[PDB]
Amino acid sequence: AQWVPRVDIKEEVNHFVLYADLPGIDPSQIEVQMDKGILSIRGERKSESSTETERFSRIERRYGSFHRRFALPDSADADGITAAGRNGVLEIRIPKR
Amino acid sequence: AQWVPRVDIKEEVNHFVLYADLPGIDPSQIEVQMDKGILSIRGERKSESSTETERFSRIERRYGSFHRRFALPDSADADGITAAGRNGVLEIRIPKRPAA
Numbered sequence: 001a002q003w004v005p006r007v008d009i010k011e012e013v014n015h016f017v018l019y020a021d022l023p024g025i026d027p028s029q030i031e032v033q034m035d036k037g038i039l040s041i042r043g044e045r046k047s048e049s050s051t052e053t054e055r056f057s058r059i060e061r062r063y064g065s066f067h068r069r070f071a072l073p074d075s076a077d078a079d080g081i082t083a084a085g086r087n088g089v090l091e092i093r094i095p096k097r
Numbered sequence: 098a099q100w101v102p103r104v105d106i107k108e109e110v111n112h113f114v115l116y117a118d119l120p121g122i123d124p125s126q127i128e129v130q131m132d133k134g135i136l137s138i139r140g141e142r143k144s145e146s147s148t149e150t151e152r153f154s155r156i157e158r159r160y161g162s163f164h165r166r167f168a169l170p171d172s173a174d175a176d177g178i179t180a181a182g183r184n185g186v187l188e189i190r191i192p193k194r195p196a197a
Contacts, residue, residue, distance in 0.1 A: 006157035008146045019145055021120040021158050023185030048116065049105050058167070060103035061118050070155070088120030088185020 002064030007041065009070060016076060018092040020068065027085030032092050034078035041068040041090070099161040100142055106167060113173050113191040117165070120185030121158075127187050131175040138187065139164040172196060 008019040020041050022030055030043040047063035049056055072094070080095040105116040117138050119127060128139035144160030146153055169191065177192040 006159070007155065008144070008153060008158045009155040010145065010149060010153045012149070012152060017145070019158060021118070021185070023118040023120045025184060047105065048107070052107070055109065056105060056107050058104070058106040061105045061116060062103070085184070087122055087182070088118070
C-alpha cells in the first residue's frame with residue numbers, strides 16, 4: 001500500500017459487491033484474494049508520472065502498489081468471488097455462504 | 098452530485114499530455130474542450146453507491162459532475178487535442194502550436 005484506490009463496499013441480501021476505482025491497471029494485474037475472511041485487492045499502478053518526471057507540471061494522480069484489505073463477514077463466500085473491470089472500475093462480487 | 102477527478106499534466110516534446118483518472122466513465126461521455134488557453138475535461142460519473150446507500154459498509158468512491166479546467170501555456174494548440182481512455186484513464190494529448 002503506497003496509494004489507496006477507492007473502494008465502495010456494499011452488502012446485499014445474498015452477496016457483497018466491492019467497486020474499486022483502479023484506473024490505469026489491467027484487470028489482469030489486480031489480484032483479488034480472500035484469505036481467512038480478509039478480502040485483499042492488491043496490485044500496482046505504474047503511472048507515466050514515473051517516466052520522465054521533471055516534465056510534469058501537475059501530478060494529482062496517485063500510484064504505486066496498493067493493497068486494500070477488508071475484513072469481510074463470515075457470510076462472504078470466498079469461493080464465489082468473481083471480479084470484473086470496466087473503465088478502470090473493478091467490481092468484485094461475492095456471494096453469501 | 099459533484100466529483101473532482103485527479104489529473105496529471107505532462108509537457109512532452111511535441112505534446113502537452115493530460116492524464117485524467119476518470120474510472121467508470123465511457124470515454125465517449127467525457128467532454129474535452131479547450132477554450133481561451135484553458136483545457137476543460139467535463140462529464141458526469143454515476144455511482145452504484147447512490148442506490149441502496151445504506152447497504153454500503155464503506156463508500157470511498159466519488160462521483161457526479163466533474164468539470165476541471167487547466168489554463169495551459171499559450172503554446173498549447175486547441176485545434177489538435179486528441180483524447181483516448183484506457184482502463185478509466187483519459188489520456189488527453191494536446192500538440193504545441195510548433196512554437197506559437
